[PDB]
PDB file of C-alpha atoms and ligand atoms in Angstrom:
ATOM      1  CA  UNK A   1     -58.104  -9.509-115.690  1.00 31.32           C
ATOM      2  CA  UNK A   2     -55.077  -8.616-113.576  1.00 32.20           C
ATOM      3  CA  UNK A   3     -54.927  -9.705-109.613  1.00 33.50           C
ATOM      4  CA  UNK A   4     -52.380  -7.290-107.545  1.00 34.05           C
ATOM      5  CA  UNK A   5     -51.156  -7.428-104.022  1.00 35.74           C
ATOM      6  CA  UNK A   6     -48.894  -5.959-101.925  1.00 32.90           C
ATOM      7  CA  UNK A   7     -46.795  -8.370-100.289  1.00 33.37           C
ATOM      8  CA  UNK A   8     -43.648  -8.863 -98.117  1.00 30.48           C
ATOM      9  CA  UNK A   9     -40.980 -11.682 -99.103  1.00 30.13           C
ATOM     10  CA  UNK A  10     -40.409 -13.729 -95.968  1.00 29.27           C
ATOM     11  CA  UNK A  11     -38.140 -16.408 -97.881  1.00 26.86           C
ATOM     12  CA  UNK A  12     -38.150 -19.835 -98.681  1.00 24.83           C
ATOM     13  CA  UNK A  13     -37.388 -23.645 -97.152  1.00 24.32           C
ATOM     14  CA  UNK A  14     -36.708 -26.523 -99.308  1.00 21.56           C
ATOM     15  CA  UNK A  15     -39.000 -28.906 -99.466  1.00 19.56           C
ATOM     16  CA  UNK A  16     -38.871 -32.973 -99.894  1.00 20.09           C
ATOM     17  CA  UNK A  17     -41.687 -34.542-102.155  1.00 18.78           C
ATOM     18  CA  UNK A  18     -42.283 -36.984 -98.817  1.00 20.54           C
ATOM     19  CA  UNK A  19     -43.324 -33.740 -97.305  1.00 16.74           C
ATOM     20  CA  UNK A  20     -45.746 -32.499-100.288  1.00 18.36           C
ATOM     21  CA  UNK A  21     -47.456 -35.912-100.389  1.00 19.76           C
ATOM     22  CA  UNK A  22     -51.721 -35.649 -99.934  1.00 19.11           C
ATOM     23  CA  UNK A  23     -52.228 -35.993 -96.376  1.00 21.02           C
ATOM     24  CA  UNK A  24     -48.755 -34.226 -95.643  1.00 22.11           C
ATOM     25  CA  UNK A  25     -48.980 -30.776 -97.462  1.00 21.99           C
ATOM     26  CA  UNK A  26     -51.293 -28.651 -95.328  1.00 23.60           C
ATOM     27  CA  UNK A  27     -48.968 -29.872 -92.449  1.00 22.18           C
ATOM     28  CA  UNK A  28     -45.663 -29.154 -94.027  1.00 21.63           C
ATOM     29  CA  UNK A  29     -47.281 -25.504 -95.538  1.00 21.30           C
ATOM     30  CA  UNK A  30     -48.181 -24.452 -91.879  1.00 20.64           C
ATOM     31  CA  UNK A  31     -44.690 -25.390 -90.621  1.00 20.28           C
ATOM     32  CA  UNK A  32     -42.874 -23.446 -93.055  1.00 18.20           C
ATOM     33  CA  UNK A  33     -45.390 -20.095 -92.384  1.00 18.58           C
ATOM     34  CA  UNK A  34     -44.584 -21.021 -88.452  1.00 16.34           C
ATOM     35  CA  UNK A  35     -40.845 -21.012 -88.928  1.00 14.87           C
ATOM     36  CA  UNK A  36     -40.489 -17.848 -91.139  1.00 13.18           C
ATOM     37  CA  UNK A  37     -43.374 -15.939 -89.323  1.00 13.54           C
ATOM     38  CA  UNK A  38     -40.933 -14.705 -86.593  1.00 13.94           C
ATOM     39  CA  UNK A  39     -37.373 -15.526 -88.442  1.00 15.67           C
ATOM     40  CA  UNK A  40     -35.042 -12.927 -90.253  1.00 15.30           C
ATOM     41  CA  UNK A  41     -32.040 -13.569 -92.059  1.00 15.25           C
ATOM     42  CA  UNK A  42     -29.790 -10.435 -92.992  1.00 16.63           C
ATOM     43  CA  UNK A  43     -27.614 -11.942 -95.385  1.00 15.29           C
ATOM     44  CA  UNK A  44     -27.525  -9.882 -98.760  1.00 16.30           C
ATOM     45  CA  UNK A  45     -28.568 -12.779-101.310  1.00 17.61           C
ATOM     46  CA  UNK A  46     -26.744 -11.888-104.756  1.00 16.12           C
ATOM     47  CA  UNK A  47     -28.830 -14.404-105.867  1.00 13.79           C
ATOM     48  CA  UNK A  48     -32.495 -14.384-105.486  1.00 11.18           C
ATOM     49  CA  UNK A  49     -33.377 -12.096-108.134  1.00 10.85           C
ATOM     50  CA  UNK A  50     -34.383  -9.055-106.442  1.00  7.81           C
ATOM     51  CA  UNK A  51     -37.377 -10.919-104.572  1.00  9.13           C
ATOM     52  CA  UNK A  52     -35.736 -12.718-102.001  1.00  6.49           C
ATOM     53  CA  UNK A  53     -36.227 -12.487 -98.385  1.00  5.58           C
ATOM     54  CA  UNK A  54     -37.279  -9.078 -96.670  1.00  6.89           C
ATOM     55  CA  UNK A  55     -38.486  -7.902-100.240  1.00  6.99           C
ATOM     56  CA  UNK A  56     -41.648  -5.583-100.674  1.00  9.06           C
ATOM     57  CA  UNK A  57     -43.352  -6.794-103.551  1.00 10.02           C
ATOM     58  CA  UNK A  58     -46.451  -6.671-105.789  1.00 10.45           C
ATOM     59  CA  UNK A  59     -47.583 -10.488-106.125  1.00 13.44           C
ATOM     60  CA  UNK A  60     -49.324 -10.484-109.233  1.00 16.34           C
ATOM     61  CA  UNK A  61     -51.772 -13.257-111.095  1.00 16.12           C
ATOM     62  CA  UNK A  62     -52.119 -12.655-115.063  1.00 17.45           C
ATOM     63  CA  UNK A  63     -52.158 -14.681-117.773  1.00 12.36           C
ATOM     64  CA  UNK A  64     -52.069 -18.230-115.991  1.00 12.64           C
ATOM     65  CA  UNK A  65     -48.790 -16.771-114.349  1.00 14.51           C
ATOM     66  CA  UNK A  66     -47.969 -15.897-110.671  1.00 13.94           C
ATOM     67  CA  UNK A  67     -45.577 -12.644-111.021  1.00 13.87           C
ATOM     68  CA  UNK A  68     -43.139 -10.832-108.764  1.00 10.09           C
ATOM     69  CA  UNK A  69     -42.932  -7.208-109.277  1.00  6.13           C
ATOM     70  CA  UNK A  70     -41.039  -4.724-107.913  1.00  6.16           C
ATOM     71  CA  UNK A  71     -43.190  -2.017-106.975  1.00  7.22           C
ATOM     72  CA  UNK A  72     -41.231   1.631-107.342  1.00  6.28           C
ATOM     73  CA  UNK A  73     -39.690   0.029-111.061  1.00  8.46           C
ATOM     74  CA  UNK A  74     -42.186  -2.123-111.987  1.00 11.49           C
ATOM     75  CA  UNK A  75     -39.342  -4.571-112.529  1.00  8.60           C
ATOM     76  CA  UNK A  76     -40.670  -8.166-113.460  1.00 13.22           C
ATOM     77  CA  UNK A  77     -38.295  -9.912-110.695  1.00 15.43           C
ATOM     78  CA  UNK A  78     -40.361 -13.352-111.143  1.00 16.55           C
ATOM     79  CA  UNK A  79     -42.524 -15.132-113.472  1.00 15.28           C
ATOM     80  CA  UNK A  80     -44.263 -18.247-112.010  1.00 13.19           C
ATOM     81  CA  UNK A  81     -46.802 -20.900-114.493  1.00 15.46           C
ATOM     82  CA  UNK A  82     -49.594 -21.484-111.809  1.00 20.48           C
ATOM     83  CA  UNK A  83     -50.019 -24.808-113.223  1.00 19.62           C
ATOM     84  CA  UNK A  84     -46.408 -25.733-112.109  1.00 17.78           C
ATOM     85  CA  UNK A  85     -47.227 -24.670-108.087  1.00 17.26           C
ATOM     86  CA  UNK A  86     -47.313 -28.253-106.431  1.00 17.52           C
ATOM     87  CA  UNK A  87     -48.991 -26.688-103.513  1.00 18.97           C
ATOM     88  CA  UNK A  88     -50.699 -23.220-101.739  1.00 21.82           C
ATOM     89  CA  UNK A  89     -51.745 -22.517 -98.594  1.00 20.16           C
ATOM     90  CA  UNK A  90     -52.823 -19.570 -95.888  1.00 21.84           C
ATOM     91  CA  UNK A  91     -51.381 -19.469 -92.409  1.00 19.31           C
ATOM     92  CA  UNK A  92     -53.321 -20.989 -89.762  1.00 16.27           C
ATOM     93  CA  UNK A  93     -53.131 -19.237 -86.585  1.00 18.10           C
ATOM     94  CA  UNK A  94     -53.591 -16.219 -84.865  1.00 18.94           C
ATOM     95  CA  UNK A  95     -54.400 -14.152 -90.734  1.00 19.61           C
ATOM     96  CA  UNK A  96     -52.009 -12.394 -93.764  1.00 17.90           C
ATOM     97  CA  UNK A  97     -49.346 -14.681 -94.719  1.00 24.04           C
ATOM     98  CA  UNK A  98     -49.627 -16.975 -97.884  1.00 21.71           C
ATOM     99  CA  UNK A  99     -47.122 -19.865 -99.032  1.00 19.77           C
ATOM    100  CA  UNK A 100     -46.832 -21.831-102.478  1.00 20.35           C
ATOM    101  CA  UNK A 101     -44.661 -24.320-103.323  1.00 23.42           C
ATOM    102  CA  UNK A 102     -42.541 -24.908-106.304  1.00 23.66           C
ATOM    103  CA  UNK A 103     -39.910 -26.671-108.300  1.00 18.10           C
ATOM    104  CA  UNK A 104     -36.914 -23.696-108.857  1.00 13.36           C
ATOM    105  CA  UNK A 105     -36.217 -24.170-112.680  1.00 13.60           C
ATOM    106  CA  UNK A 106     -32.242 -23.585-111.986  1.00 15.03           C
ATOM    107  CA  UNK A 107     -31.604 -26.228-109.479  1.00 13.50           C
ATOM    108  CA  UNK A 108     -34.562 -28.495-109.990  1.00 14.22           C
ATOM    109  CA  UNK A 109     -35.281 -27.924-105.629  1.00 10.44           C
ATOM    110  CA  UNK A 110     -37.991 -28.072-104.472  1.00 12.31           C
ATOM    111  CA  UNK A 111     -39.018 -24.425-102.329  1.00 13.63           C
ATOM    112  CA  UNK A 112     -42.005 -23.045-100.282  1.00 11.73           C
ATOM    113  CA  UNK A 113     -42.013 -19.314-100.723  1.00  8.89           C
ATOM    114  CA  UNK A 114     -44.040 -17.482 -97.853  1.00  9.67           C
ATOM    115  CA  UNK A 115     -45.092 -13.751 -98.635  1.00 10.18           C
ATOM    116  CA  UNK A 116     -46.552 -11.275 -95.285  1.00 11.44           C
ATOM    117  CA  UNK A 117     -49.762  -9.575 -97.356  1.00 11.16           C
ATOM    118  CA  UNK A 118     -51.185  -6.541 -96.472  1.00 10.58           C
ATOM    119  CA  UNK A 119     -54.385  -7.610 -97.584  1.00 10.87           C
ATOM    120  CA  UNK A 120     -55.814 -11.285 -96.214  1.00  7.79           C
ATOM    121  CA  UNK A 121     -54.332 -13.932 -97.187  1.00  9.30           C
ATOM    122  CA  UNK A 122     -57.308 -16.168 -98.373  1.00 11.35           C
ATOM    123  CA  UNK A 123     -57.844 -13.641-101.430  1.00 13.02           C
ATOM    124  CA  UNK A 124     -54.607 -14.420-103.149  1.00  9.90           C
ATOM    125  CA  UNK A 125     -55.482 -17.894-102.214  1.00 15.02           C
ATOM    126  CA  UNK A 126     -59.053 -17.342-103.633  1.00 14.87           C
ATOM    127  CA  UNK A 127     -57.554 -15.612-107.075  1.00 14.24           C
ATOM    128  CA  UNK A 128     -55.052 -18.645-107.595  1.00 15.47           C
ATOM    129  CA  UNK A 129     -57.880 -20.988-107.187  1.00 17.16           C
ATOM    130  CA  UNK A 130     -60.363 -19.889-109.545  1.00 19.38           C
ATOM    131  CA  UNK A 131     -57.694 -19.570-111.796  1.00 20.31           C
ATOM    132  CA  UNK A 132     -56.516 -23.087-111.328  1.00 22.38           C
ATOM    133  CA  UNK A 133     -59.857 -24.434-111.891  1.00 22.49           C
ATOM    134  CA  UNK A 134     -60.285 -22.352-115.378  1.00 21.01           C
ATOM    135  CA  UNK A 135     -57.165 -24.437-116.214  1.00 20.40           C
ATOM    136  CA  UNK A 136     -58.606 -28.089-114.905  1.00 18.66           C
ATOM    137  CA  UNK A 137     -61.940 -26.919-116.588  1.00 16.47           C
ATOM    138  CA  UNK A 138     -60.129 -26.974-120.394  1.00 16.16           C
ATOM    139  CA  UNK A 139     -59.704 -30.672-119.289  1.00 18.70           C
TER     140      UNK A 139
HETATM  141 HG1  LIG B   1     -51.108  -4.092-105.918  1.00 20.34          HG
HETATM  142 HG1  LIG B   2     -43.817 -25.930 -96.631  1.00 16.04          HG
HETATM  143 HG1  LIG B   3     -54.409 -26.035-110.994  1.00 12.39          HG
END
């Protein structure tokens, strides 16, 4: 009924729609997940709605809806529409962190948001699918 994980904000990169094309996005998802993996920016972000980079977090899946919580108030920092995420992914290598890209309401960019998880990776992954298919499946 509810899906809940503890993850870490790692930030986002801004995405083209060249780079989200089939054939492209598994490339450009990896990339992103390379390039935060080991990055830090300090910079207080006024901004970013209390979920931006550095952030612990509860990523949450209820009600066809990726949410951002934050986890001592319980704060609803984020409210996603899984069928609005152009893209997801896990990270490849040598695994914990999970990506998803989409279109920032605000400023119409485009943005791949990458999240360190305590648990693996390929569950949240797993959870977003199945509910992305119930979605397709009322098609
Ligand atoms: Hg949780
Ligand atoms: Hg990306
Ligand atoms: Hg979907």
């Amino acid at each position: 009924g509810i899906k809940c994980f503890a993850v870490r904000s790692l930030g986002w990169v801004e995405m083209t729609e060249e780079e989200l094309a089939p054939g492209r996005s598994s490339v450009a998802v990896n990339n992103c997940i390379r390039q935060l993996s080991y990055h830090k920016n300090n910079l207080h972000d006024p901004m970013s709605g209390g979920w931006g980079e550095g952030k612990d977090l509860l990523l949450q899946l209820e009600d066809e809806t990726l949410k951002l919580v934050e986890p001592q108030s319980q704060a609803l920092l984020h409210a996603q529409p899984i069928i609005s995420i152009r893209v997801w992914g896990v990270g490849r290598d040598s695994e914990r962190d999970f990506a998803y890209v989409a279109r920032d309401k605000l400023t119409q960019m485009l943005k791949c948001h990458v999240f360190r998880c305590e648990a693996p990776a390929k569950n949240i992954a797993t959870s977003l699918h199945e509910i992305c298919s119930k979605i397709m499946a009322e098609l």
